[model samples]
Target: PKDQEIKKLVDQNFKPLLEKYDVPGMAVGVIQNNKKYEMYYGLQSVQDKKAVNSSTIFELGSVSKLFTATAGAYAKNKGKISFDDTPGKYWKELKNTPIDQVNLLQLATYTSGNLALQFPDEVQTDQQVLTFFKDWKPKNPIGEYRQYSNPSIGLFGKVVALSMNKPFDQVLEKIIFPALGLKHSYVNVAKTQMQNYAFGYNQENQPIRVNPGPLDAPAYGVKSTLPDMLSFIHANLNPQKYPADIQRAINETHQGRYQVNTMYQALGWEEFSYPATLQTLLDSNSEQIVMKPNKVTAISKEPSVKMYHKTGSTNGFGTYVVFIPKENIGLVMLTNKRIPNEERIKAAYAVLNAIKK
Candidate 1:
């Protein structure tokens, strides 16, 4: 009865929020005590008039970094590499550069001395990416500050792949995806699944989809449906449902390594400790951290959390995912439009609060 009531509340509030923002389509889901509640609204394709549904695929954007970071953790657990190992261990060319001093841990945590958010358009291939790293300069000493970046984490993924002696997509789809029991999520979608993939829109209301940049698939290339994304939240909440190695990898990913303002940065997730409220998360995600490099303090131990979340976007799509591990509750919001982060956070916070009440 409580679950139904919460679902009804979400149904009630979600419509107005969608209308307020004029969102094209959205897929949302919540989990309470391992039971699932889901809602879908609007069109997956505006021109085709296809309604959004559980199976409609949307680009996950930066949320894909979580998968990248987890794969890195899995690589560590497999003894393929160490987080403390320098990038030079895998990409020997970096051995003579300042970038060589940066380790996997710093990159995963976005504290690799302020690497650029992305590579220049000219750096198109893996070799080019490596060459860019070879000449890279540090804005701050390694682990000195946090600079949220794709190139930083993208290289993190690349090194993980190199350490495993496999390609990035193969490591994710063949290794991580299967290990996490992801069925409909992918870095590279096949021909059969093309129809299910939704067309996200840009500011001019034109259709767009993911096209790989120099940083590659690890930065922002995952395409997944609502059910599959919820499966990931569930995995993070109760990793023991999977293999021992998976459980370990998930835990390692959540171990907080830095504290930036009111929030804690885990491998890919941002955490707010118990008693932390919506404002705590809002304050932590302020423009200072989102738009530029900011000084961050090292935190050796993971903070206790009532909530953990991550937000992501591509040119055309946006995503927000949050979970209360102790409550065994989580929620995911996916949209074809790149809605404002503040509004998205407000909506999810509203639903989370109502459910908790």
Candidate 2:
């Protein structure tokens, strides 16, 4: 696609969603094989009226789950842990608990019987985190139900970090970033990049950003720019250029393990069969499916080609990423206002659908 065509299609799809959601600014990255394109619109901050740029950082929210999931694969590749390993092996307090019997694979895939979307307000301290899991029982057997929960993936990340004998943020920033060649992304923003960070807006139109809690780094705490995330997407779309272990790790994340209604589950991605329709994307990403427990069953294997995606948001920022490896096309959409996941899907799908030719 020519530069003009990419801009035209992007404007057509994203402009209205920005207005409807009162977005302060938005950034987009489009990748097709080796060609990459980017567009930045509006202000990073309304009061400062600073223009959005390639360097502007936006909170990734749950999209950070992908990095955590990838980190787990990286750890396993290094012989630090196995997906089938029991969580109790990493934490003694969890011994004999319901979750102790479940494996890391179940937690990473949101199939650990059950875990809540958010921990109770009372579960602020580390001791409480231990006690909470010990007391909580699974609604179904491990791998039998898919209930998307931060605690599940967060704990999965914790165990990954424990296996590597490092902090979660350190595992990501020091090891994974260099390994993936991501120069500008961070679990914690760097001082030099501080000026580039965009302020997200909440429902009351107040400036805000993620106020993280325990296990937040592995779950909802990542800041990145369009270019940086696009590179991560590229690494995912084309793993052949990487080392064997890293390539295998990346491929494993893309492999489907379970079905959730119209969508299938990968390590961190929600997938649709290739040539996916807009309706299917919308249906699978809807709030109902995300918030409620859904019937999940194991699959023998997934298709060779798939449309992989995930949506993330803090109160003030919203993000969406979608790519089809077979097509060699990928995109990242970032906004400083909270847009519904369905709208992000529509806008991204429109551009991706347009450019996939």
Candidate 3:
């Protein structure tokens, strides 16, 4: 049962924020140690006149990396690949690009020293991949800055495919997706689920459907629903149903290895500290907690609880997923408007605080 006091606080704090943000549509879900609840507000699309609901699907943007990381971890746990392995060893056909110079661990940790974002106009074949890498170059030196890189993840997916002896999407769908029973939401969703898909918007209020750039299949471009995402959160917080690798992916992706000042990499995800004030709220028995990494805060507030999450933002969408293993709590929020990712993160905390209180 939920605390009436905290539920009241959550409503008091979060509702006004959503109204203030003018978030056209938002879906928020909370899962506490087996109990689950979801709520949606606003319109799904201004142009299409769709309604946002618990079943609506949203593009995860970079949030999809959680799936990518899980695939890598599963391959490693199955003894199909190793972090020390070189990309060329598996992808003999991977030529003309710098795949030979990158290793499994380096690529997974964003330490491969590649470009932060590289959106290719087209991604039809391996040759197109070679053409893009050969033509484009990275500005930051490998390992100098902790800038997140799509080139690293995109190429990492290639390595995953080669190890699994399947196409990248195939590997995600066959191995990774099935292991999680994720209904393809964490990978390339089925067409049947596409009709309810929400189009992202830009700050200018212009509709900005995701470009699904050249590396779309790799770093981003996965479709998902609240029901699917909550299942993922359940597995992340409790891995008894999943393989050891699934937990490892979540842990390694948010473990904060090789910190370059405040930023760190854990597999394909970023790791950081939370603020104390927020930590207290999240853990306090009073039923209010606040944890939002979308603001780029300086270290988290509380260190007592270990929190792992992946957040994503693009032209029209804002998304975030948070899990505290120790607390056995998970919260996920996705929005169709071009609202700032931080807004949803904050709103998620408000809801969680309410649930706690």
Candidate 4:
């Protein structure tokens, strides 16, 4: 009964927002009191006039980083790799290079010194990635700065795969995705599933989808449905239902290893202490960090109210996922067209605040 009541209110508040924002299609999911509330709205394709539903898929850009970080942690938990271990341990070519000095954790946390956002055009293959690392020099010392880059985290995912003696896509499709019961999500879209995939749009209303970039599908290349993505949110909220390794991997990924002001960086999630105003969360996500070396600070040890979330985007899509663990509530919002972080937060916060009632 309460679920229906909440759904009504959510629809009332959400539908108009979609029209106001001009989002072609979107999906929203909420988890509360061990219950799930999901809503689908708008067209999956403007041209086809196909409606979005639980099965319609959208690309998960940087939000996929959450999986990459979890995979790295899983490998570490299984003793297949160590965050402290050097990349050279798996890839011998990096054995004596500057990259050998950089540990796996640094790459996962975006603290690997000076990695660019994406690799240069010339560096396309695995050998080239290794070559770039071999010749690379840190613009800042390890664990001292935060530069958000796909190539940095992408390489980290690659190493996680290497440590597991599997390719990144195999590890994700066969291992990570299945571990979380994500049947509809994928690193590489399948031919059959292609029919369910939504067409993402750019600023000019041009339709597009995730392009296979140089990183080989690690950093920003996941395509998933609302139900499947919500499954991921559920796993993150209650990891104990999974195997020991999966549980520990989920736990490790949430550790706040670095902090910049009120903004705290956990593996792939950004977090804020609970009761942190919406403005605080927005500021944390929007504030620009100097790309120079800075000290990494540990988060406070004492437990309190906290919120952890991540935002993702590509050429034609935008996404936001957030949860307050202590309160047992969370939200996931996915859109076909790129939208501002503020609007995403605004819609998510509205529903979350209502669910808090």
Candidate 5:
């Protein structure tokens, strides 16, 4: 009954934003106590008039970091690699790349001092990935500040592939995807599936999709629909079928491993806590808290709730994934339009606030 109301509110709140923002199509997936439901609204292709649905694929953008981070976690959990391992230890390509000082765990959490957010148009291939590393250097010292960088995590994925002695896609197919039963969810989406893939729009509101960048299927280039990602959230929340190591790795991923401002960022998730006085501040009403970029929790005005989330955005896509243990709930929202970062955060808060109310 509560969920029904929450769903109603979600639809109500989102409908207006989608219309106001001119979102072509969007998918919202929610999970409560391991039960999942994903709803789609709007058109996947305005020209063709195809409605968005559970099967409509969207580019996950940087949220794909979760997959790469989890892959490293999975490997470590299986004793295939240790968290203490260094990038230089596995990849000969990184042998001379100053990795002697960086820890594997740091790479997983974006604490690797070497991570950079610099996106160049020319870097597009595996060779370019190697070239980028050779030419680029980190701004902060290793493990200094939580500066989110693409190259740092990109290297982590490459090293993971090296350790597994398999190509990245094969790693996804032969091991990772199967373990999670994500048959339809994938990287390097085939040309045929491209027909069903939602086209991302640029500033001019035109299709501007590009081939997966240097990260390709590595750092942030995975594709999936709402249903598949909901499965991932369910597994992370309650993984009875997953092996103990996998479950623990998921735990590690959600654990508060590091601090970025007032918020705690774990392996790949960010966490926030409700202010203790919130209960008294609003008699009988609970508060919900989420990690904000400045390390502060969401406004302390409502129910007390904690969320583990990963946010992503690119030229044409924006996405959010939040898992709340207090409510036994998880949410995934993917959009085909790229909004400014502040607007995206507001959008995320809007979604959470809708549910909180």
Candidate 6:
């Protein structure tokens, strides 16, 4: 079968990766020329010896940013919010605070002075969130540096919720996920759904999943099955097939806002020029890019034929998604073990490269 042929392409690269990383399970979804194929490999955990299936859920980490960003874009598409709107606009309590100097787009793109990668240890409550914003100061001017952070995106999601007058999880689960026809995605996995949840194995091969933290739900709290994640990517790859408003929101997130070398910083996903080498993708997604602020030049235009991608991980899981809209091909890699981004990127690149042939 043609699907087997497609699965074969992924199998060659992914099989060894699972063994090398000590990953108990992995899910690979491939979409090419509008045909879909999925392959599941290994156990859910060595402890349970349960096999991975279509229903098995894994943490999405920062990849959850895609949905949060889409929700923000949807708000903007419906005129409920604007990219230039400040956090205080939806929550007036923040107007006189540090938000006077920042706007929605800056938070979405990680371009503020320094939002930091994680929230401070002490900030865990809703009141604490407001308190932190009340006394905040912008150390670097907005739009000057791209500091990858969960805090900024988490706050961005919070504002999107406020603008829509609903809680953040409801916005996605009820509105966004349903719009995309996602059946098994969640901001907080329910007890009824717990049976399918896959435990992530960390570096020490410890079984774990992401614990709730301040802004955790918005930032890194999404969990999903392979097919649902691919369907979300499918919505991204072919936004025109969805309702006009929802489609426009998906498209809005793809516009390039900033440039750093071979990559364009989109709202949640990263863009790379087509025919991009593995080294370029590696350099763009490396720790250097994540840990330090990278000076990014503003982008006025984005490539028509390009690769849109994002890598996600928590302590226990690692996932990568990539697709080329023009060519109608995309790949999603989800593993129960936290592996290196390089390995994830390389594996996807190889499979996509093979499909191109």
In candidate 5, what residue range of length 10 has the lowest lDDT sum? 284-293
Q: Distance from true position, residue 322, model 2, in Å?
A: 0.3
- Candidate 1: residue pairs that collide: none
lDDT of 1: 0.85
Every candidate's CA RMSD: 1.5, 1.4, 6.1, 1.9, 5.9, 1.1
Across residues 1-357, which tens digit of lDDT does each residue of candidate 4 receive? 767866776677566667766789888888888888888888889999999999898998889999998889899999999889988888788888887788888888888878867789888776787778888887788778788777788878888999888989889899989998899988888999888999998867778987656775889988899988888889888998898998999988888877877777888888777877888778756637423444567655623667898888888888999988877888888889878877788777877887784
What is candidate 2's lDDT per residue for 1-357, written digit by digit as tens? 478898888889987877887888999888985788999898888778888998899999999999998999988888889888988888778877878988999999888877878888888888888888888787887788888899999999999999989989999899887677788889999988888899888877788889858678988998998888988888888889887777777877887888876689988988889898889888876777888777786776677668899998877899998889888999999999888888888888888887776
Model 2 misplaced regions, further than 4 Å? none
Off by over 4 Å in 6: none
Rank order (by TM-score, best first):
6, 2, 1, 4, 5, 3
| Model 1 C-alpha lDDT per residue in residues 60-144, reported as the tens digit of each score | 8989999998999999998999989988889788886888888899988888876767777798987888788888888797898
Better structure of 3 and 5 per TM-score:
5
Q: Candidates' lDDT values, in order?
A: 0.85, 0.86, 0.65, 0.83, 0.68, 0.88
- Candidate 2: the clashing residue pairs are 201-316
Candidate 1 vs candidate 6: the lDDT winner is 6
TM-score of each: 0.96, 0.96, 0.81, 0.94, 0.84, 0.98
Quality of model 6 by C-alpha lDDT = 0.88
lDDT of 1 at 236: 93
Which one wins on TM-score? Answer: 6
User: What lDDT score is found at residue 320 in candidate 3?
Assistant: 83
Cα lDDT over the full model 5? 0.68
Best by lDDT: 6
